[PDB]
């Protein structure tokens, strides 16, 4: 999980002006690596 | 993969006598009788084929 979430606000007065913004960018990632490998051999020799 | 390889042996050996004491089969002998007594390969090739 990764998050970048930011809130900015500003008022200025002289007349008045204001700005307010919120951004929140986010990622989530998952990986699953399941695996199997079975092997075998049999010799038989009879006389 | 599977490999199986198998033998059974029931006559441990036979040993035929040497050529002096072997008796020929009548047909084979009768064929030898007609071989041309000269190198005519056409006849001998028939014998080797049969």
Please tell me what DSSP assigns to residue B38. Answer: S
Cα dihedral across residues B34, B40, B43, B44: positive or negative? positive
Spatial contact of A1 and A25, defined as CB atoms under 8 Å apart:
no
Spatial contact of A5 and A26, defined as CB atoms under 8 Å apart:
yes
Query: Which of A31, A29, A30, A27 lies closest to A3, judged by CA?
Result: A27
Q: How many helices and strands, by DSSP H and E, does chain B display?
A: 2, 0
Resolution (Å units) = 3.3
CA A13 – CA A16 distance, rounded (Å): 4
């Amino acid at each position: 999980e990764a998050k970048h979430c930011v809130r900015i606000e500003t008022k200025k007065r002289v007349a008045k002006k204001t700005k307010v913004e919120h951004r929140c960018t986010t990622n989530k990632l998952s990986e699953k690596h399941e695996g199997s490998f079975i092997q075998g051999a049999e010799k038989s020799i009879s006389l | 993969q599977l490999l199986v390889v198998e033998n059974t042996v029931e006559v441990a050996q036979f040993i035929n006598n040497n050529p002096e004491f072997l008796q020929l089969a009548e047909p084979f002998w009768k064929e030898l009788s007609h071989l041309p007594s000269l190198y005519d390969y056409s006849a001998y090739r028939r014998l080797i084929d049969q």
